[PDB]
Design a protein around this nucleic acid. Structure first.
Ligand SMILES: [Zn+2]
Lengths: 71, 70, 35, 46, 57, 60, 97, 45
RNA sequence: AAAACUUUCAGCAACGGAUCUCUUGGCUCUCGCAUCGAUGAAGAACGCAGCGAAAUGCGAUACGUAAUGUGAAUUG
RNA sequence: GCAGAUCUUGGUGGAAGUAGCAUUCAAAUGAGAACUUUGAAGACUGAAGUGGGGAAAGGUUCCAUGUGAACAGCAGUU
RNA sequence: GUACGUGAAAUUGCUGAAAGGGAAGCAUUGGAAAUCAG
């Protein structure tokens, strides 16, 4: 085996010898991405997972991110 | 069931982070029974199993009846 | 192999249990799918 | 250092509909399907 | 019927091979019933299953 | 089950003893499910879980 | 109907020229064929003892003549073929009581 | 199931499960006086 | 030179999934607004239902808790 | 607005049912036994095993029970 | 009848009718048989 599971992206693209993921570039701080790879971007961009927190923010915006309790 | 009626050992499905010490405390504080040995394994489905051997002063069948899974 | 990380045991178990017949009552509640 | 220092394949039978090096073919090779004969005569007339 | 499991158990109990294991051909019903290792020892002492002796050298 | 307003009308150690009691009851009910239970017990499992959540919510 | 008789079979003339490896299987195929023709019963059962005598000298060597016993045993009418030991297999067919 | 391949697959599993269990009871059972084929004539008003 | 076989035509039955109608989808245009993250994001993994594999939801308070609204369901 | 583009995608033909792909007996089980099971006989590997274990690798593939859809260049009770 | 709306053609089996001496398709003119306007 020349690749193993990547800790960041969870794909079996972590090169053992180079100790680097061919998919997301782990362990570089930034994610690997390319503008020639348009289909690659859409495979892992925002919305392909849960977006649990962004859905909360979008829902909170309308009321002005208010806090407290109703009367 | 064979282990319970033969070796006075109760078999539990325990938490993944539980170690032999915590399983002993949990069994002791949940059933008022003192274990003398705990041997654990990880099942292929990612769940932990604990063999809790009881003292000869206690009967594993009695504890099993009390729990209700007998 | 044998000396396998525990995450692998969870990883292998979930992958296998996905291959599982979909319950009969599941279908009765309108619709449920594969894959 | 100095002293140290194509095969024709017809697209038929098993060789039809290929994409890469076919079976039992090595080195430099060329493919022919008999459709390019019409183009070959045209290029000669050119 | 299928006595493959019995043969494997009989070989394990007798500590011999499956080739040395011999079953009574007319007791297939009781042999098939015996499915645990304790039952295999039950049959063996009854003589229903016999370990074939070694031959010559 | 457990009503949240009467839960909020109690003290923290009383809420702790109720939580301990409910966790025991949940453990017994899940024991009944593995040993073969009735629909009433299996339906009681979910109510007990929500009751634990309400007590934990009030404590927090 | 039900009757038993002792026959002898000229196994040599019946396996003449047969391939060596098939001598024993072809021998059994002829005993059953011999039984079917003589006793006019399609069902034939070969005694395991008679099978042992055919195979005693390997798969290629089959005795030239065999003394066989054929009986029209009632079904559960089939011919049961079993070996018979005689000093010299050259005698007539006899009607066994 | 809005997915046509999946609803077909579940039906075939359902059909096999039904047919297997119908004959599980049928072989267990094996009545004529009570259970008689009802027809349109028998259902005539 | 009858039958079989071959072909033609018609009927019926298959095989196939065209056509027609449809459509909680796509595509295009226009309009309004400006809001991710060390107070841990996007993404990944694993889990959670009485009976669940996907998808959805959620996180050991786990197909949800509180609160407010509605007012009598859920539904295989 | 198609007859064609060694056209695209799907469907279906003739070729063509064509090219082709060391066991024997009795018994048990079964709707069904050239292939399952047991016993007998005959053979094959012959300690360098068709033996018995591990590493790496696979991931449940171990065991028991049931079924005989798809697998099986045949079939099965597999 | 879930191998589920409609269900074309290619193609296949069946029945009916007819043709058939090393191709077939087609065109023209009529005959026969069947069937339409009538
Ligand atoms: Zn990665």
């Amino acid at each position: 085996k020349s690749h193993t599971i990547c800790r960041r992206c969870g794909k079996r693209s972590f090169h053992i010898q180079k100790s680097t993921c061919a998919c997301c570039g782990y362990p570089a701080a930034k994610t690997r991405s390319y503008n020639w790879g348009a289909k690659a971007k859409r495979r892992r961009t925002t919305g392909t997972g849960r977006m649990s927190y962004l859905k909360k923010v979008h829902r909170s915006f309308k009321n002005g991110f208010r806090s407290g309790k109703p009367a | 069931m064979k282990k319970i009626e033969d070796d006075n050992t109760l078999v539990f499905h325990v938490h993944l982070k539980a170690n032999k010490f915590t399983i002993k405390e949990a069994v002791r504080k949940l059933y008022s029974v003192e274990p003398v040995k705990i041997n654990t394994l990880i099942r292929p489905n990612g769940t932990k199993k604990a063999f809790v051997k009881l003292s000869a002063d206690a009967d594993a069948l009695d504890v099993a009846n009390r729990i209700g899974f007998l | 192999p044998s000396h396998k990380s525990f995450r692998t045991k969870q990883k292998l178990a979930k992958a296998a249990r996905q291959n599982r017949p979909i319950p009969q009552w599941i279908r009765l509640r309108t619709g449920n799918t594969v894959h | 250092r100095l002293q140290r220092v194509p095969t024709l394949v017809v697209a038929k039978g098993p060789n039809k509909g290929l994409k890469s090096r076919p079976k039992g073919v090595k080195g430099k090779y060329k493919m022919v399907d008999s459709r390019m004969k019409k183009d070959l005569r045209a290029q000669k007339r050119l | 019927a299928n006595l493959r499991t019995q043969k494997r158990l009989a070989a394990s109990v007798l500590k011999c091979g499956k080739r040395k294991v011999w079953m009574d051909p007319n007791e297939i019903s009781e042999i098939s019933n015996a499915n645990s290792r304790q039952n295999v020892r039950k049959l063996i002492k009854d003589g229903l299953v016999i370990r074939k002796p070694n031959l010559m050298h | 089950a457990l009503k949240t307003f009467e839960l909020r009308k109690q003290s923290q150690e009383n809420l702790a003893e109720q939580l301990q009691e409910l966790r025991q009851e949940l453990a017994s009910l899940r024991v009944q499910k593995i040993a073969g239970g009735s629909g009433s017990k299996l339906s009681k499992i979910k109510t007990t879980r929500k009751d634990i959540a309400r007590i934990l919510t009030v404590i927090n | 109907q039900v009757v038993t008789r002792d026959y002898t079979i000229h196994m040599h003339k019946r396996l003449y020229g047969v391939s060596f490896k098939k001598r024993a299987p072809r021998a059994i195929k002829e005993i059953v064929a011999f039984a079917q023709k003589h006793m006019q019963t399609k069902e034939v059962r070969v005694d395991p003892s008679l099978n042992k005598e055919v195979w005693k000298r390997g798969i290629r060597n089959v005795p030239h003549r065999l003394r066989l016993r054929l009986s029209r045993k009632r079904s559960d009418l089939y011919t049961y073929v079993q070996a018979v030991d005689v000093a010299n297999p050259k005698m007539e067919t006899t009607v066994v009581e | 199931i809005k997915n046509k391949i999946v609803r077909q697959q579940q039906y075939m599993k359902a059909l096999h499960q039904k047919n297997k269990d119908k004959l599980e009871r049928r072989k267990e059972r094996a009545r004529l006086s009570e259970n008689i084929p009802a027809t349109i004539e028998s259902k005539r008003v």
